[PDB]
Design an enzyme around this catalytic site. Sequence first.
Site, PDB file in Angstrom:
ATOM      1  N   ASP A 171      50.363  72.084 113.077  1.00  0.00           N
ATOM      2  CA  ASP A 171      49.256  71.273 112.292  1.00  0.00           C
ATOM      3  C   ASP A 171      49.083  71.787 110.882  1.00  0.00           C
ATOM      4  O   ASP A 171      48.297  72.600 110.589  1.00  0.00           O
ATOM      5  CB  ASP A 171      47.700  71.360 112.707  1.00  0.00           C
ATOM      6  CG  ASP A 171      46.773  70.372 112.498  1.00  0.00           C
ATOM      7  OD1 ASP A 171      47.164  69.604 111.779  1.00  0.00           O
ATOM      8  OD2 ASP A 171      45.662  70.505 112.855  1.00  0.00           O
ATOM      9  N   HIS A 188      47.317  66.883 110.693  1.00  0.00           N
ATOM     10  CA  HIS A 188      46.403  65.912 111.380  1.00  0.00           C
ATOM     11  C   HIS A 188      45.467  65.316 110.535  1.00  0.00           C
ATOM     12  O   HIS A 188      44.664  64.189 110.746  1.00  0.00           O
ATOM     13  CB  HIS A 188      45.461  66.596 112.611  1.00  0.00           C
ATOM     14  CG  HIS A 188      44.192  67.397 112.259  1.00  0.00           C
ATOM     15  ND1 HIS A 188      44.167  68.725 112.239  1.00  0.00           N
ATOM     16  CD2 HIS A 188      43.052  66.742 111.894  1.00  0.00           C
ATOM     17  CE1 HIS A 188      42.764  68.889 111.936  1.00  0.00           C
ATOM     18  NE2 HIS A 188      42.309  67.896 111.497  1.00  0.00           N
ATOM     19  N   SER A 245      38.768  70.969 108.896  1.00  0.00           N
ATOM     20  CA  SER A 245      40.136  70.913 108.969  1.00  0.00           C
ATOM     21  C   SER A 245      40.865  71.225 107.652  1.00  0.00           C
ATOM     22  O   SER A 245      40.396  70.614 106.423  1.00  0.00           O
ATOM     23  CB  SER A 245      40.393  69.773 109.633  1.00  0.00           C
ATOM     24  OG  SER A 245      39.950  69.536 110.938  1.00  0.00           O
TER      25      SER A 245
HETATM   26  C1  LIG Z   1      41.000  63.171 109.100  1.00  0.00           C
HETATM   27  C2  LIG Z   1      40.382  63.674 110.199  1.00  0.00           C
HETATM   28  O1  LIG Z   1      41.120  62.986 111.337  1.00  0.00           O
HETATM   29  C3  LIG Z   1      41.401  64.050 112.715  1.00  0.00           C
HETATM   30  C4  LIG Z   1      42.140  63.300 113.645  1.00  0.00           C
HETATM   31  C5  LIG Z   1      42.215  64.051 114.707  1.00  0.00           C
HETATM   32  C6  LIG Z   1      41.179  65.174 114.997  1.00  0.00           C
HETATM   33  O2  LIG Z   1      41.468  65.857 115.990  1.00  0.00           O
HETATM   34  C7  LIG Z   1      41.278  65.234 117.502  1.00  0.00           C
HETATM   35  C8  LIG Z   1      41.745  66.274 118.134  1.00  0.00           C
HETATM   36  C9  LIG Z   1      40.510  65.601 113.871  1.00  0.00           C
HETATM   37  N1  LIG Z   1      39.583  66.895 113.917  1.00  0.00           N
HETATM   38  C10 LIG Z   1      38.350  66.786 114.332  1.00  0.00           C
HETATM   39  O3  LIG Z   1      37.721  65.849 113.989  1.00  0.00           O
HETATM   40  C11 LIG Z   1      37.784  68.358 114.376  1.00  0.00           C
HETATM   41  C12 LIG Z   1      36.832  68.494 115.383  1.00  0.00           C
HETATM   42  C13 LIG Z   1      36.316  69.538 115.545  1.00  0.00           C
HETATM   43  C14 LIG Z   1      34.954  69.746 116.561  1.00  0.00           C
HETATM   44  C15 LIG Z   1      36.660  70.448 114.792  1.00  0.00           C
HETATM   45  O4  LIG Z   1      36.199  71.928 115.050  1.00  0.00           O
HETATM   46  C16 LIG Z   1      36.678  72.624 115.930  1.00  0.00           C
HETATM   47  C17 LIG Z   1      36.290  74.102 115.751  1.00  0.00           C
HETATM   48  N2  LIG Z   1      34.750  74.483 115.955  1.00  0.00           N
HETATM   49  C18 LIG Z   1      37.593  70.604 113.867  1.00  0.00           C
HETATM   50  C19 LIG Z   1      38.098  71.793 113.120  1.00  0.00           C
HETATM   51  C20 LIG Z   1      38.434  69.196 113.616  1.00  0.00           C
HETATM   52  C21 LIG Z   1      40.506  64.863 112.807  1.00  0.00           C
END
Ligand SMILES: CCOc1ccc(OCC)c(NC(=O)c2cc(C)c(OCCN)c(C)c2)c1
Length: 247
Positions: free
Chosen positions: A97, A46, A198
């Site tokens: 992922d 992702h 992430s």
């Molecule tokens: C280059 C990053 O492009 C992305 C594209 C899609 C994305 O997801 C959407 C569901 C994400 N994920 C996040 O933004 C994200 C958000 C939160 C709150 C998170 O923590 C959850 C655990 N406490 C994480 C790990 C990632 C990133």
Amino acid sequence: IIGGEFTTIENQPWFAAIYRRHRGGSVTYVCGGSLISPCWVISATHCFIDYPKKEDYIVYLGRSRLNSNTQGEMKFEVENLILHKDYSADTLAHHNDIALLKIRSKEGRCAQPSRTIQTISLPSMYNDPQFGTSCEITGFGKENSTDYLYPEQLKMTVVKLISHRECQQPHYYGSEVTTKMLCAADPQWKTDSCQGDSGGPLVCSLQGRMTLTGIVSWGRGCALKDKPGVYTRVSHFLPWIRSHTKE
Ligand SMILES: CCOc1ccc(OCC)c(NC(=O)c2cc(C)c(OCCN)c(C)c2)c1
């Protein structure tokens, strides 16, 4: 990372810092990764799915700070960006992922291990710690949900593995969490992964070995009660990994 401590790369030598270059010359932080062998970094699909062009990326190893240099750090191009064929995204979950970045310096070399640059061992097939096991996460992610910038300094924290039964309750994630995923969280919900974490490692001590058990993947909010961090369950992707780290 919500809560936890600031840390330095010598405590997480396999941690990889992954950035993207833009038109104009600016570089933004993308996601964390983990060095699994000298030429290979493992992260989350992702992170790259929207900008799959391997030339846009820079990977650092031995790096402790977001926007400044660390003594001993090493900079890599991405020779090969492998995304999971069956990657997908629902409202909350990402499935499959998992990504592989083949790294090489400008001189054509892979990583050279040092005190600040080391590999992390993969788990063996379907071999996970038991729930209630304490494991560590590392990242440059947000320290609070209300933040709009990432910390300048690497952080780590310790979370505990949560059973699939617990994580699959309706008020947690129900059936959105699968067997190819692992949940982890603080029993008091004060420390957690967050946006920007992430791709980074969930590290557990497995049979006396520091083992890459999980990859930071998703969750609802950051340190929310009854909402654990969700991680790619590495032990269920060994064949995928093995096949793409070859020829
Ligand atoms: C280059 C990053 O492009 C992305 C594209 C899609 C994305 O997801 C959407 C569901 C994400 N994920 C996040 O933004 C994200 C958000 C939160 C709150 C998170 O923590 C959850 C655990 N406490 C994480 C790990 C990632 C990133």
